[PDB]
């Protein structure tokens, strides 16, 4: 009957790149999800599969919290059955998704005056990802037919590129933190409730 360590997820000072999205597993706690339901900052609260008011009286075996930071206009890709750089190469949700997506604009900390280099988004990949698949590999994307051997060049591209999040940047390009809640049910006792 301890409180789920949610704050450490949403209030973290550092979030992971969308290509290297972080995953916090939750267990054996009581989650007052209402705590984050009472906050206007978390405006974007697109949830699929369940109503938030209803699930506060529900129980699941495990809950997973995936977090990363994306661009302002690229939040939509965080939804089941979408396409783009993010959903194809970085963070794909399955067609049959039964959790929520929370996203808000962190322009005060996720942005720099000199431009930030702490954020990368995978741009090239030979194949689209599988639901919840993670790829941190940084091997050159061979688009031509001559091997790249590990140096960028013609038809040889280093995959990750860095977002130039800046304070004066346009909303569509202003920074954005995303928290993705998955809820699973299995034969194991439900250790997460409200």
């Amino acid at each position, epitope marked *: 009957t301890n409180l789920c360590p949610f704050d*450490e997820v949403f209030n973290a000072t550092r979030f992971a790149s969308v290509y290297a999205w972080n995953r916090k597993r939750i267990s054996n706690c009581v989650a007052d999800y209402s705590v984050l339901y009472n906050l206007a900052p978390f405006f974007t609260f697109k949830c699929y599969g369940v109503s938030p008011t209803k699930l506060n009286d529900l129980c699941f075996t495990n809950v997973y919290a995936d977090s990363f930071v994306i661009r302002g206009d690229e939040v939509r890709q965080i939804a089941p059955g979408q396409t783009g750089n993010i959903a194809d190469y970085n963070y794909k949700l399955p067609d049959d998704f039964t959790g929520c997506v929370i996203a808000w604009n962190s322009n005060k900390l996720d942005s720099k005056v000199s431009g930030n*280099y702490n954020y990368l988004y995978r741009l090239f990949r030979k194949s689209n990802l599988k639901p919840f698949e993670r790829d941190i590999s940084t091997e050159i994307y061979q688009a031509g037919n001559k091997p790249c051997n590990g140096v960028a060049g013609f038809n040889c591209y*280093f995959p*990750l590129r860095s977002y130039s999040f800046r304070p004066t940047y346009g909303v569509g390009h202003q920074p954005y933190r995303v928290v993705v809640l998955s809820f699973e049910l299995l034969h194991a006792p439900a250790t997460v409730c409200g």
Partner: antibody
Amino acid sequence: QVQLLESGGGLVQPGRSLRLSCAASGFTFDDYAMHWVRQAPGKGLEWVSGVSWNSGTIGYADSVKGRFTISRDNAKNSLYLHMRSLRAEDTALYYCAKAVEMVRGLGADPEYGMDVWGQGTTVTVSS
Amino acid sequence: DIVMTQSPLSLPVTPGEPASISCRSSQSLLHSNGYNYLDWYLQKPGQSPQLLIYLGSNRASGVPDRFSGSGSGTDFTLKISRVEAEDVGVYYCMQALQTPFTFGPGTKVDI
């Protein structure tokens, strides 16, 4: 007992890549912010990069910014450091150190206190 | 982009006396909490370095009570109440506030 083992050293020509790996064994790897610190040959130390508890990088050194790329993996307890645009001035030992204060144990999250240090590798570059 | 200095650059110590070393910064490290973020580290020659003091003056774990840390603002000092035969090497002071972090040029202590 706590163990931090690094691997990836070896002579490589200028203008290539390398991938150093540091593996931790003996503690909850997700409550400690790791750091990668170089050590020039016969000189003082120099901070290179780091990573917080949530896989969120904390910036690189001013003179190295542009090439190095850090990454973490809590599932395999492994921290990795991809290195690009290798130049002659990048020959040094490399230690991977761990923070002291466990997160949420007391204002903001902790990042200081490189206490436990593995025996670094011996990366070198020449032609 | 913070630059730190140390003094004296190199001092010879003899076993059985205290010694004092000063680390100076450019911007005062007083955070909103009221804590200084400077750390003191000893890199023994031929062995990986080790931690001495964290959080300004809070003594690190596992080291004897012969070390003392003090100071604030832009000036901090480390004093060895009693020095012995196993206190020779290099000393560094490292910032823990405005990233990137930095390490001082280093003080060389010998017999």
